[PDB]
């Protein structure tokens, strides 16, 4: 009865930019992860600290789902330990990450002949993001600490768009990513598999 | 327990595209992940490709990896070849029994400008002489290609023994360095009018001379 | 940003045990998503993998080294260690510690783990020999004729064993123009190298030049003033 709403995470119409990634807390339902691992349409399917295969036998406190778009060559940065512009400045998995990383090609939805520029990423910041931190700001970044009123030299626009073209190479093509994070605190189990 | 085979060396012009292949002897190359490591002279290795074709951050977009199962091989490909890509490249994989490394491929970028060496010659220090030892230090830098011969002279006549000469080694700017040491007694240093280091490179010769003072 | 630092004995006598320690910073050795391993490189040759470990104590070995290899983790010091017993001259190598790419399960349930190296340490040079350690004799190479609008001055590091030495200048404050030449291995079995720095000709009066030699296998440091 209490079928967990993974279909509205995965089959949602629009995904957000990676700098402005979006979280759905999922609790207090019954889960069927076999909807995920039966399918062959994922290009990335990696689970850390837990097999996908055994997920229907476990019970968890909170399951979080995090979603965003990256270009194809950036999907590798959504893994524990990795660095680069996406891990450093947009979305960061912790070292002791428990969960899955799920990605599929969306060149049919999210590219264009002229170029899709709707998906942004941050490329500079004062520090690296902590695990699961988020930076939504629209400021001018000064390397020293000065006030900047216009984007100039030593006064940086910190955001840049991906440009998604339909004819591009597969590493420059858009990919929707869903990151499933699993907790089971001293809290009672709210999410369970069918078994 | 399989092996992996790499060419010993590989040569290509700048701007061109080069491919180092790595051929697995038994089993299928597709059964296990293939990594590529780059090593400059004097440095620790750096990972440039993992999981057959994934490129860590900081490695240029020109580096790419691929798998070809019809020849049971993996391939590192460097497009738009630059002087900065001269290094050793090692492939690496594994099975249930062990990791397996390639023997390594020396990548040479061609068309590099011939450069003749600069030579610095130092006499013994007063501190070394006043401990009854004498060394002449001949330092040889910035030459390309990496093959020199060094000859020492005492008063115009050649010196045979007490000469130690390094083998040329790669600097960071892809030109080469070498050095040569002449050991003398303190008397030999003062009993001659001068001593010379003579460096011969691609037919031409650079000679330096030092004298007691 | 993870860093790895090897430390080791430098020289080790044959039949004895080589003992090495890698010190992790920017991360914890306790992190059970990763493995941590040792790779070696004898002079002239390529790479060979030795062993890897994770926080539990689960271990993979090179089968040809396994009877001589012990690898452990010490979560209390953020370290992991390698011991290689009954060394001979075939164990003379640079030893590298490293962290692997993270372990993960695929959609089918296959467990990928310890398949390749991601962050490398800087390497530690290990020599196996019956010869004894010998600290270096450091002599100045004064500027004289040092031809140009610049001048060359040096630092001769003579008759040491084993490798390596590091040379800096003015406690690292001077980096430009520094050229440390590779060592010669003389007929005696001792090493010598030199380190020069090209300096401005005018600045010989005002600025003083110290080379800081360091020979870790004999626990020697020499700060040698070089003077006109
Ligand atoms: C999304 O829709 C497809 C068909 O439209 C369906 O087969 C798939 O299971 C859905 N995904 C989820 C997570 O329910
Ligand atoms: C599922 O629905 C039942 C019916 O109300 C409810 O009692 C239960 O708490 C729900 N959740 C789980 C995890 O069974
Ligand atoms: C695939 O279909 C459903 C997924 O919801 C699952 O319950 C079923 O056991 C799966 N069967 C096979 C053969 O994979």
mmCIF file of C-alpha atoms and ligand atoms in Angstrom, chain A residues 1-2 28-30 189-192, ligand 2:
data_model
loop_
_atom_site.group_PDB
_atom_site.id
_atom_site.type_symbol
_atom_site.label_atom_id
_atom_site.label_comp_id
_atom_site.label_asym_id
_atom_site.label_seq_id
_atom_site.Cartn_x
_atom_site.Cartn_y
_atom_site.Cartn_z
ATOM 1 C CA UNK A 1 0.000 0.000 0.000
ATOM 2 C CA UNK A 2 2.724 2.394 1.097
ATOM 3 C CA UNK A 28 7.576 6.012 6.396
ATOM 4 C CA UNK A 29 6.656 3.924 3.344
ATOM 5 C CA UNK A 30 7.547 0.491 1.968
ATOM 6 C CA UNK A 189 12.816 1.826 10.841
ATOM 7 C CA UNK A 190 10.380 3.795 8.681
ATOM 8 C CA UNK A 191 11.411 2.600 5.164
ATOM 9 C CA UNK A 192 11.511 -1.129 4.462
HETATM 10 C C1 LIG D 2 2.163 1.097 5.898
HETATM 11 O O1 LIG D 2 0.724 1.271 6.002
HETATM 12 C C2 LIG D 2 0.153 0.781 7.226
HETATM 13 C C3 LIG D 2 -1.343 0.972 7.114
HETATM 14 O O2 LIG D 2 -1.769 2.168 7.751
HETATM 15 C C4 LIG D 2 0.768 1.507 8.427
HETATM 16 O O3 LIG D 2 0.240 0.966 9.633
HETATM 17 C C5 LIG D 2 2.286 1.358 8.417
HETATM 18 O O4 LIG D 2 2.867 2.107 9.481
HETATM 19 C C6 LIG D 2 2.862 1.823 7.076
HETATM 20 N N1 LIG D 2 4.322 1.732 7.055
HETATM 21 C C7 LIG D 2 5.071 0.615 7.125
HETATM 22 C C8 LIG D 2 6.557 0.830 7.109
HETATM 23 O O5 LIG D 2 4.587 -0.516 7.189
#
